[PDB]
């Protein structure tokens, strides 16, 4: 049972390390894509819907301005993002199809996930029923089991970073804070609402911060609002560090029990961080109806199927101000992004 998981994970590590040690580089060119529409813009850069002319396939192309990455001190984080994304392979992790760079920009061409962000659906509907949230939570549990076995820390879990595919399953799309680390790490990064108390308290932290963020995600999906919110991030931190969580009266006893163990300030008591590892989560009563293999194999019927008018349809995404992709005649930050 856990022997089959062990075997699966061992072959997964073998495939990952080959790509980790020998990364794919310069696999396409900007001129091979027809730029269609901006899907999103933020600290992650700009993401555009593109059409690959040689195949007619649609993709999501992330554009990062090299000079902006430098000013924002995201060089190493950007090199981590691309190195890890090109190396991983899991049903709930978005595929990196091509990467390349020019004088001005870095480009990551990923599979286009047309269902839109979980965030959009979650805010509109208000909240997900427990079976609905459990279906998505189970996919993250398996994804973190996969990632952590490769010594990867994720650090960017939130509904804004989870997309819904055509089959109703989750696609984890944001590797900007992902890092391969064996010991502890100290970078202050992530989103206020999702930060573990050890990150806020400037301690060295590890993969246990991803299990805390999962507690935050499960609560927000099932309640419609996060366990710790305020108008200012300082007030959110004050709530996270105090050891108090309040649950909606509609929360089941099993759900509250799982969430008290995930949103555990004490690391020697936090689920996912103990001797039994991920099995403390997989075997919790709230997950009793979950068939982990059927979830991985994508055999379970999804609680929600997004509206899909056709290929290239962007109705599940918000509208953004379009800006022209300007490529300078001069190479910027060549040395910094040499390995990209």
């Amino acid at each position: 049972e856990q022997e089959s998981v062990k075997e699966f994970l061992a072959k997964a590590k073998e495939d990952f390390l080959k790509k980790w040690e020998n990364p794919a580089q310069n696999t396409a060119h900007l001129d091979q894509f027809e730029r269609i529409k901006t899907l999103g813009t933020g600290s992650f850069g700009r993401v555009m819907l593109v059409k690959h002319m040689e195949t007619g396939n649609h993709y999501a192309m992330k554009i990062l301005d090299k000079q902006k990455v430098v000013k924002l001190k995201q060089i190493e984080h950007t090199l981590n993002e691309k190195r890890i994304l090109q190396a991983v392979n899991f049903p709930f992790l978005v595929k990196l199809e091509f990467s390349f760079k020019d004088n001005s920009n870095l480009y990551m061409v990923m599979e286009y996930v047309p269902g839109g962000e979980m965030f959009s659906h979650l805010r509109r509907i208000g909240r997900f029923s427990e079976p609905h949230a459990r279906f998505y939570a189970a996919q993250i549990v398996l994804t973190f089991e996969y990632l952590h076995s490769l010594d990867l820390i994720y650090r960017d879990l939130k509904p804004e970073n989870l997309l819904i595919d055509q089959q109703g399953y989750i696609q984890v799309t944001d590797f900007g804070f992902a890092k391969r680390v064996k010991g502890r790490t100290w970078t202050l990064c992530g989103t206020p609402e999702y930060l573990a108390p050890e990150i806020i308290l400037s301690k060295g932290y590890n993969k246990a911060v991803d299990w805390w963020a999962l507690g935050v995600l499960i609560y927000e999906m099932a309640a419609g609002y996060p366990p710790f919110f305020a108008d200012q991030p300082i007030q959110i931190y004050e709530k996270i560090v105090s050891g108090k969580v309040r649950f909606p009266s509609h929360f089941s006893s099993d759900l509250k029990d799982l969430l008290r163990n995930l949103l555990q300030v004490d690391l020697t008591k936090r689920f996912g961080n103990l001797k039994n590892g991920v099995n403390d989560i997989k075997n919790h009563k709230w997950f009793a109806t979950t068939d982990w293999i059927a979830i991985y194999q994508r055999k379970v019927e999804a609680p929600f199927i997004p509206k899909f008018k056709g290929p290239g349809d962007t109705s599940n995404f918000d509208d953004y101000e379009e800006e022209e992709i300007r490529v300078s005649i001069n190479e910027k930050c060549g040395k910094e992004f040499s390995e990209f």
């Binding site: 805010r123 609402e193 305020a230 108008d231």
Partner: peptide, 18 residues
Amino acid sequence: TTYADFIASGRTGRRNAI
């Protein structure tokens, strides 16, 4: 209600990374 307090807050949109 907590839902009404959340909806009236300035943190219901896409949240920026720190």
